[PDB]
From a paper:
The proteins MakA/B/E can form a tripartite toxin that lyses erythrocytes and is cytotoxic to cultured human cells. Here, we identify the proteins from the five V. cholerae genes, vca0880 through vca0884, that are coexpressed from the operon makDCBAE and analyze the crystal structures of MakA, MakB, and MakE. For structural analyses, MakA, MakB, and MakE were crystallized in their soluble, compact forms in which the hydrophobic β-tongue is hidden in the interface between their respective head and tail domain. Each protein is predicted to undergo a conformational change in which the head domain is unfolded and rearranged into two long helices in order to assemble into a membrane-bound tripartite complex.
MakB and MakE were refined to 2.1 and 2.0 Å resolution, respectively. MakE is structurally very similar to MakA, with a root mean square deviation of 2.3 Å calculated on 329 aligned Cα atoms. Its tail domain, 85 Å in length, consists of five long helices (α1, α2, α3, α6, and α7). The head domain, 55 Å in length, comprises two parallel helices (α4 and α5) and a four-stranded antiparallel β-sheet (strand order β1β5β2β6). β1 is very short and originates from the tail domain. MakE also has a β-hairpin (β3β4) protruding 90° from the sheet. Two molecules of MakE are found in the asymmetric unit, along with two nickel ions and four sulfate ions. MakE, which has the most prominent break of the α2-helix, has no proline at this position. In contrast, the hydrophobic region in MakE constitutes the first central β-strand (β2), the β-hairpin β3β4, and half of the next β-strand (β5). Similarly, an elongated form of MakE was modeled in which the tip of the long α3/α4 helices is hydrophobic, albeit the hydrophobic residues are more concentrated on one side. MakE, with its shorter β-tongue, can penetrate only a single membrane leaflet.
Author numbering: 6 to 192, 199 to 356
The structure:
């Protein structure tokens, strides 16, 4: 596998992990709890949750909604440099094959060397995005841990409903595993997104005191995996409602609090997955850099036509791969997101 062959896999994988974070962020923004008749503990839950939602709005103000715009533009710049220089490079390779010439050799070497400029920008833009993502993630995790600790204190004090609190927490933890199984399973291009809302502590006339959000997304359509995820989450919620039948609505509100962490926790997961995908992508981009450095070095040292054409297999293989990368990256950069919203009650 060459570097460019690997990048055919590694580049959509990183954009794949990025789109998920948009959906997790959207799940946070759409999570809501109303005070109702609650007393004493509500103010801090509301404060903690508002603190997490503020961090998402700050993150989105960067403009990196479905993916890093700077990483995408550096990919496109590499691909366009290949596309724009193909004929001049192939012309020189051909001429040099027939008769070695020092000036044309220096010319062809300068053309390959122009590939290294958008490659440096890509590697630098990956590090700058990863650094900002990791800084933000640590703040999200701190805020998640504050809200979690608030909820644990409230719940451990409601000694008369610990049976129903445990049965509900059990279902919430199953929903987390089902979300994780979906993401495992998905690991014609576009951006396809489903946002979920989970209704808890309902009112007889309609509505509820809690709306817990989460979201998933992918760059190829996967309507079947989404449906299985939705049926699993529905069945978990139906189980929660069955197990809370013996509680008042005010007790339902307390027993359901950890659903507020569902989408916050997914933000933590998704940030981590992007970073791992970017470590992997960084390694492959440096492997492309070092292939170009080896061609530049071999061209600089070549004395005859034979030395020169040995470097043309690297070039033509990379050109063709990069024209496929161009089409995928442009499709994804041009895509209008296709969003569907699912209420689970
Ligand atoms: Ni208290
Ligand atoms: Ni039962």
């Amino acid at each position: 596998q060459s570097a460019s062959e690997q990048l055919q896999t590694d580049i959509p994988a990183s954009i794949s992990a990025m789109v998920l974070l948009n959906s997790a962020c959207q799940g946070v923004v759409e999570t809501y709890i109303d005070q109702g008749n609650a007393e004493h503990w509500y103010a801090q839950v509301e404060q903690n949750l508002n603190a997490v939602q503020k961090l998402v709005r700050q993150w989105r103000l960067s403009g990196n909604l479905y993916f890093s715009n700077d990483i995408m533009d550096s990919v496109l710049s590499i691909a366009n440099t290949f596309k724009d220089s193909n004929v001049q490079i192939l012309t020189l390779f051909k001429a040099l094959e027939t008769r070695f010439d020092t000036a044309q050799l220096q010319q062809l070497t300068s053309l390959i060397l122009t590939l290294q400029n958008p490659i440096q920008s890509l590697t630098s833009n990956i590090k700058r995005y990863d650094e900002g993502l990791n800084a933000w993630a640590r703040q999200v995790e701190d805020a998640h841990n504050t809200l979690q600790q608030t909820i644990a204190q409230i719940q451990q004090e409601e000694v008369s409903i610990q049976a129903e609190i445990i049965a509900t927490n059990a279902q919430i933890d199953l929903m987390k595993q089902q979300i994780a199984a979906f993401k495992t399973a998905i690991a014609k291009k576009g951006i396809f997104e489903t946002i979920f809302g989970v209704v808890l502590a309902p009112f007889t006339l309609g509505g509820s005191l809690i709306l817990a959000g989460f979201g998933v997304s992918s760059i190829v359509e996967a309507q079947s995996e989404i449906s299985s995820l939705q049926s699993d989450i529905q069945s978990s919620l139906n189980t929660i409602n069955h197990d809370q039948q013996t509680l008042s609505q005010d007790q339902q509100q307390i027993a359901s609090l950890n659903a507020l962490l569902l989408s916050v926790d997914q933000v933590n997961n998704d940030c981590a997955a992007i970073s791992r995908s970017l470590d992997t992508l960084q390694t492959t981009v440096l492997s492309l850099y070092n292939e170009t450095n080896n061609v530049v070095s071999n061209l600089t040292k070549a004395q005859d036509s034979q030395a020169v054409i040995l470097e043309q297999v690297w070039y033509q293989s990379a050109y063709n791969e990069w024209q496929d990368i161009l089409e995928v990256a442009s499709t994804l950069n041009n895509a209008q997101p296709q969003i569907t919203k699912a209420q689970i009650k």
